[PDB]
Amino acid sequence: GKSTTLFSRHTKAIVWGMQTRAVQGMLDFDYVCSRDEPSVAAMVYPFTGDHKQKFYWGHKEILIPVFKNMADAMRKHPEVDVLINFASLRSAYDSTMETMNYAQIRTIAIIAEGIPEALTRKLIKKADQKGVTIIGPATVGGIKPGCFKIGNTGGM
Amino acid sequence: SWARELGLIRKPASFMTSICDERGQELIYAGMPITEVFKEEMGIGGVLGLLWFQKRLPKYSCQFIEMCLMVTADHGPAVSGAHNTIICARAGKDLVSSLTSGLLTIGDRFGGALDAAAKMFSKAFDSGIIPMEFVNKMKKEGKLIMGIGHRVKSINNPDMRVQILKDYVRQHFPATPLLDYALEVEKITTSKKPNLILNVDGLIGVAFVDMLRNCGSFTREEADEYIDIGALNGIFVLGRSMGFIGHYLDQKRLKQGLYRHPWDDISYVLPEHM
Amino acid sequence: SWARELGLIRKPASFMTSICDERGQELIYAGMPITEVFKEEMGIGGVLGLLWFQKRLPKYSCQFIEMCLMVTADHGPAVSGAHNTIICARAGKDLVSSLTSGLLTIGDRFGGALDAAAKMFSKAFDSGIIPMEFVNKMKKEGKLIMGIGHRVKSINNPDMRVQILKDYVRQHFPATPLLDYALEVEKITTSKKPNLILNVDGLIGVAFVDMLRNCGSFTREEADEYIDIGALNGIFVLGRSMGFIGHYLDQKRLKQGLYRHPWDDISYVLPEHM
Amino acid sequence: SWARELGLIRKPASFMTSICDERGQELIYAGMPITEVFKEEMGIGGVLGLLWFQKRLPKYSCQFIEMCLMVTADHGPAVSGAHNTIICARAGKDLVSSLTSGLLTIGDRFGGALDAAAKMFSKAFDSGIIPMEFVNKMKKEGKLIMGIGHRVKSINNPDMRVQILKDYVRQHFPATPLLDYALE
Ligand SMILES: CC(=O)SCCNC(=O)CCNC(=O)[C@H](O)C(C)(C)COP(=O)(O)OP(=O)(O)OC[C@H]1O[C@@H](n2cnc3c(N)ncnc32)[C@H](O)[C@@H]1OP(=O)(O)O
Ligand SMILES: CC(=O)SCCNC(=O)CCNC(=O)[C@H](O)C(C)(C)COP(=O)(O)OP(=O)(O)OC[C@H]1O[C@@H](n2cnc3c(N)ncnc32)[C@H](O)[C@@H]1OP(=O)(O)O
Ligand SMILES: CC(=O)SCCNC(=O)CCNC(=O)[C@H](O)C(C)(C)COP(=O)(O)OP(=O)(O)OC[C@H]1O[C@@H](n2cnc3c(N)ncnc32)[C@H](O)[C@@H]1OP(=O)(O)O
Ligand SMILES: O=C([O-])CC(=O)C(=O)O
Ligand SMILES: O=C([O-])CC(=O)C(=O)O
Ligand SMILES: O=C([O-])CC(=O)C(=O)O
Structure with missing residues (x-):
């Protein structure tokens, strides 16, 4: 039972990877669309400890928490339903399958390019079992103007 | 400076402070x-609370920080750090x-019994074991209990600056559990040997952990953060700095000359031909 | 150890302490x-008087030592030493x-205005010039007056922590001549420009020399020895140690990473082909 | 001084040196x-072998220590330690x-990649695992491989001082297996 709406002005995300240019582009887009809350709630980077990244909300400086595990990224944030997977081609599969074991995630945008077709079919099968809608691979993302933008879509 | 004053540009700052x-x-300390x-008549204990912990500490704890900086001042010139200060002051430095x-x-090894004696007793108390099992858990791993053990003054011969700190943390000091735990470990180890009283290094460690986690404004994940960061090495270093500057001014006032450490105290053990 | 215990040998000792x-x-301090x-409830000012000067200072002077260790604590992280502490803490050192x-x-250059502003006004007062000719002598030789000059806070807009020390000196000191001399030099140089008020770094210097040579137990050749030796460098370093440990604990608690100092703030000016 | 000169009172000496x-x-170095x-025309690599290791190192490795002290000289003033040196020198200090x-x-974090990148590869090689299992073991535990990774110059754009040292450890240098493991 996949959803029929995906992004809104209450939609938050978890960015999997240290992709601070894409996250800053998303936060700048959410400032220029007069949103009241930043659509990136946390970042997940498994190779560094839990800290906070210093980002820009228009003129102001805010702090977005970078976690190490996906579990405590889910535990501190119950409103997150999108995960933007910036992993490589050889680590997008197990990170995506790890994400779909969390119930709040309702859409997963896989940005990676070069995942093998068998692992992608396994991802399609488990996404149809869980009902999570996956954004087709080797994407740039998808932009919903006024509401939400996935990473590097649109551009600057 | 002009493109920022009229605010047409962003630049990410570092140095969060x-x-x-x-x-x-005005010069604003923490808030x-x-x-x-x-x-508000806070001494240097109040400004240590403001600079280091960023919380206005209650008036019984600022005086305890002043007391535990008075005892961790100079402890004579034979010890290792004051020896280095004297050697570098007799070489006419600065x-x-x-x-x-x-x-x-x-x-x-020098000055790292404050932090180790607080971390050891906090790991033994937050795990939850009785002191008669903590002593045997140490004894079956090597590792002498840090913070417990004196060379001379223990029992019917007290340390006389463990006593003053202990009287202060019993009068002006509500609900101090880890000090009571550490005194139970002292009750056991002084039954082992007539020595092995609580050090000053052990008592400031456990009384400072109890000061952090037993007063207000620290929850238990800040009172467990500041022990891991090293806010007790800060107490020892800031306290002992008065003794080291006292040794510097003293060796500069006696007009002592350059030290050379005679060769009969050295015993060279060089290889044969290599 | 045995030939000296029964006392049939001589060994000359160093390290006169x-x-x-x-x-x-007991830990005997000075005496x-x-x-x-x-x-006697002497704070850290009393043990600074005991360790540094070996004299039980009167109770208005120990509190002034604690005051001048409370104002010479942290002064922001922009300054050069606190910058080095932050840079070394963000490398995760110790x-x-x-x-x-x-x-x-x-x-x-950083923090050397205590000792220079004490030595300069002491050499001007002990020679005996009017301040109106001391200012003109300092203009004829280059050499700006150390301890006079601020960047923003000028006139009926004071530093607000030179006010606290000035009122404490004016109330609880008998016989304060050198502060009067330095305030006459302030009266002249604030007629030269709305700035050029007394610093904190200059008023602690002149009030500390005033407190040494004005109160008891210091004659005139001790109170002029401890200025040459550098007791005021000791006051600034011991005061600013609380600020630097506060910056270390702060940059260690915010979990900030290694500094790298962007290349567009650097401007390499290398030679042609060496 | 006189009782020990004719020897009538033993003293325990510390500082074993x-x-x-x-x-x-003569000022006798190590032996x-x-x-x-x-x-014998040993450079400073020979006196580092004598002072630090107390052995007379062979002549290809004294030149290697001079080589790796020449490449680990200044690396620009933006880095953290040279920044502290400049900040303290501009305060007119000493x-x-x-x-x-x-x-x-x-x-x-600064300068601690030499020792960590030696300890990591030495613990991986001493254990005895293939490199493909070592990379996957480091990936499974967090812990980026220390000593691997350049911000700008890597592949058919080399570092050009990894190349000089690599040519030296290839040429004048018998039986080098840990470098071969690190290159795998
Ligand atoms: C014109 C247009 O619009 S584009 C056309 C369509 N656009 C697209 O398809 C978008 C494609 N997206 C991309 O190319 C992006 O670069 C991405 C998302 C694939 C990022 O890929 P990468 O940069 O290679 O991933 P990443 O930065 O995390 O690092 C890759 C590997 O290096 C590893 N690594 C990094 N540092 C170290 C280190 N010191 N030691 C050991 N391993 C390391 C990482 O662990 C990681 O390992 P993994 O592959 O097993 O996960
Ligand atoms: C009249 C005459 O003089 S002759 C009489 C006839 N002769 C005799 O009777 C011989 C008597 N023999 C002795 O007295 C000897 O000194 C001995 C063998 C008993 C030595 O006894 P001790 O010095 O007390 O032993 P030790 O140095 O190990 O210290 C005792 C405990 O203190 C513990 N301890 C020491 N330091 C610490 C520390 N910081 N923290 C925690 N525990 C510590 C030790 O772990 C040890 O524990 P253990 O007993 O469980 O092993
Ligand atoms: C908008 C219009 O229509 S234009 C209006 C009017 N136009 C004008 O031309 C007015 C301009 N007037 C000004 O303000 C000019 O900038 C000036 C020249 C008067 C400014 O002069 P100043 O900056 O005060 O002089 P300077 O910078 O040398 O320092 C002032 C004094 O402070 C003293 N001083 C400075 N630093 C220190 C120190 N650290 N310790 C002690 N004394 C110090 C100096 O000895 C100096 O004395 P001097 O006047 O004998 O040299
Ligand atoms: O080790 C220390 O903390 C210094 C000390 O008190 C001693 O001289 O024994
Ligand atoms: O003490 C100094 O000389 C430097 C200083 O703190 C200030 O900027 O006021
Ligand atoms: O060895 C180090 O980590 C320091 C270094 O090379 C650099 O300048 O980046």
Whole structure:
């Protein structure tokens, strides 16, 4: 039972990877669309400890928490339903399958390019079992103007 | 400077500094201006609470920080760091090079019993074991209990600055559990040997952990953060800096000359031909 | 150890240490044991008087030592030494290495206005010039008056922590001549420009020389010795150690990473082909 | 002084110092006098082998220590330790206080990749695993491989001082397996 709406002005995300240019582009887009809350709630980077990244909300400086595990990224944030997977081609599969074991995630945008077709079919099968809608691979993302933008879509 | 004053540009700042707003009308310490600091009669314990922990500590704890800086001042010139300060002061250096050259000895063997004696008793108390099992859990791993053990003064011969600190943390000091735990471990280890009283290094460690986690404004994940960061090595270094600068001014006042450490105290053990 | 115990041998000792008898029944400080230190309720100003000067200072001077250690604490992280402490803490070093690496900046240009502003006004007062000719003598030789001059706070807009020390000196000191001389030099140089008020770094210098040579137990050749030796460098370094350890604990608690200093703030000016 | 001269009172000596017998006719380094140091034409690599390791190192490795002290010289003033040296030198301090204030940054995050990148590869090689299992073991535990990764110049755009050292450890250098493991 996949959803029929995906992004809104209450939609938050978890960015999997240290992709601070894409996250800053998303936060700048959410400032220029007069949103009241930043659509990136946390970042997940498994190779560094839990800290906070210093980002820009228009003129102001805010702090977005970078976690190490996906579990405590889910535990501190119950409103997150999108995960933007910036992993490589050889680590997008197990990170995506790890994400779909969390119930709040309702859409997963896989940005990676070069995942093998068998692992992608396994991802399609488990996404149809869980009902999570996956954004087709080797994407740039998808932009919903006024509401939400996935990473590097649109551009600057 | 003009494209930022009219605000048409962003630049990400570094150096986050949640302490000491220097600019503006008054020097603001953590959230308190300098006139309120001198008006509320807080000593240097209050400004250690403001700079280091960023919380206005209650008046029984600022006086305890002043007390535990008075006892961790000079402990004679034979010890390792004060020896380095004297050696670097007799070589005619500077105040800051002498104090610095002696201060870089404060490590794990010299001056690292404050932090180790707080971490050991906190790991034994937050795990939840009885002291008669803590002593045997130490004894079956090597590792002498840090913070427990004196060379001379223990029992019917007290340390006389463990006693003053202990009287202060019993009178002006509500609900101190880890000190009671550490005194139970002292009750066991002084039954082992007539020595093995609580050190000053052990008692400031456990009384400082109880001061952090037993007063207000620290929850238990800040009172467990500041012990891991090293806010007790800060107490020992800031306390012993008065003793090291005292040794510098003293060796500069006696007009002592350069030290050379005679060769009959050295015993060279060089290889044959290599 | 046995030929000296039964006393049939001579060994000349080095390290003469007129401070802190560590061995025996108590930590004897200057001459005062540690229980007498905590019984007379002398704060850290009393133990600075005992360790640094070996004199039990009167109770208005220990409180002034604590005041001048409370104003010469942290002054923001922009300054050069606190910058070095932050840079060394963000490399994840130590408390001692971070405080030490920021402490070695306290020299002539950063924090060297205590000792220079004390020596300058003392050499002007002990020679005996009117301030109206001391200012003109300092203009004829280059050499700006150390301890006079601020960047923002000028006239009926004081530093607000030179006010606290000036009122404490004006109230609880008998016989304060050198502060009067330095305030006449302030009266002239604030007629030269709305700035050029007395610094904190200059008023602690002149009030500390005033407190040495004005109060008891210091004659005239001790109170002029401890200025040459550098007791005021000791006051600034011991005061700013709390600020630098506060910056270390702060940059260690915000979990900030290694500094790299962007290349567009650097401007390499290398030679052609060496 | 007189009772020990004719020997009538033993004293336990501390500071055991298995290096640099300073007293006598020649300043004897590790076991070798200063005239044998200068006559045998060993550079500073030979005296680092004598002072630090107390062995007379073979002549291809003294030049290697001179090589790896030449490449680990200055690497620009933007880095953290040279920044502290400049900040302390612009306060007009001293040579030893400036060098010292910048030297106290050589820790784990700055300058701590030499020792960690040696310990990591040595623990991986001593254990005895293939490199493809070593990369996957490091990936499974967090912990980026220390000693691997450049911000700009990597592949058919080399580092050009990894290349000089790599040519030296290939040419004048018998039986080098740990470098071959690190290159895998
Ligand atoms: C014109 C247009 O609009 S584009 C056309 C369509 N656009 C697209 O398809 C978008 C494609 N997206 C991309 O190319 C992006 O670069 C991405 C998302 C694939 C990022 O890929 P990468 O940069 O290679 O991933 P990443 O930065 O995390 O690092 C890759 C590997 O290096 C590893 N690594 C990094 N540092 C180290 C280190 N010191 N030691 C060991 N391993 C390391 C990482 O662990 C990681 O390992 P993994 O592959 O097993 O996960
Ligand atoms: C009249 C005459 O003089 S002759 C009489 C006839 N002769 C005799 O009777 C011989 C008597 N023999 C002795 O007295 C000897 O000194 C001995 C063998 C008993 C030595 O006894 P001790 O010095 O007390 O032993 P030790 O140095 O190990 O210290 C005792 C405990 O203190 C513990 N301890 C020491 N330091 C610490 C510390 N910081 N923290 C925690 N525990 C510590 C030790 O772990 C040890 O524990 P253990 O007993 O469980 O092993
Ligand atoms: C908008 C219009 O229509 S234009 C209006 C009017 N136009 C004008 O030309 C007015 C301009 N007037 C000004 O303000 C000019 O900038 C000036 C020249 C008067 C400014 O002069 P100043 O900056 O005060 O002089 P300077 O910078 O040398 O320092 C002032 C004094 O402070 C003293 N001083 C400075 N630093 C220190 C110190 N650290 N310690 C002690 N004394 C000090 C100096 O000895 C100097 O004395 P001097 O006047 O004998 O040299
Ligand atoms: O080790 C220390 O903390 C210094 C000390 O008190 C001693 O001289 O024994
Ligand atoms: O003490 C100094 O000389 C430097 C200082 O703190 C200031 O900027 O006021
Ligand atoms: O060895 C180090 O980590 C320091 C270094 O090369 C650099 O300048 O980036």
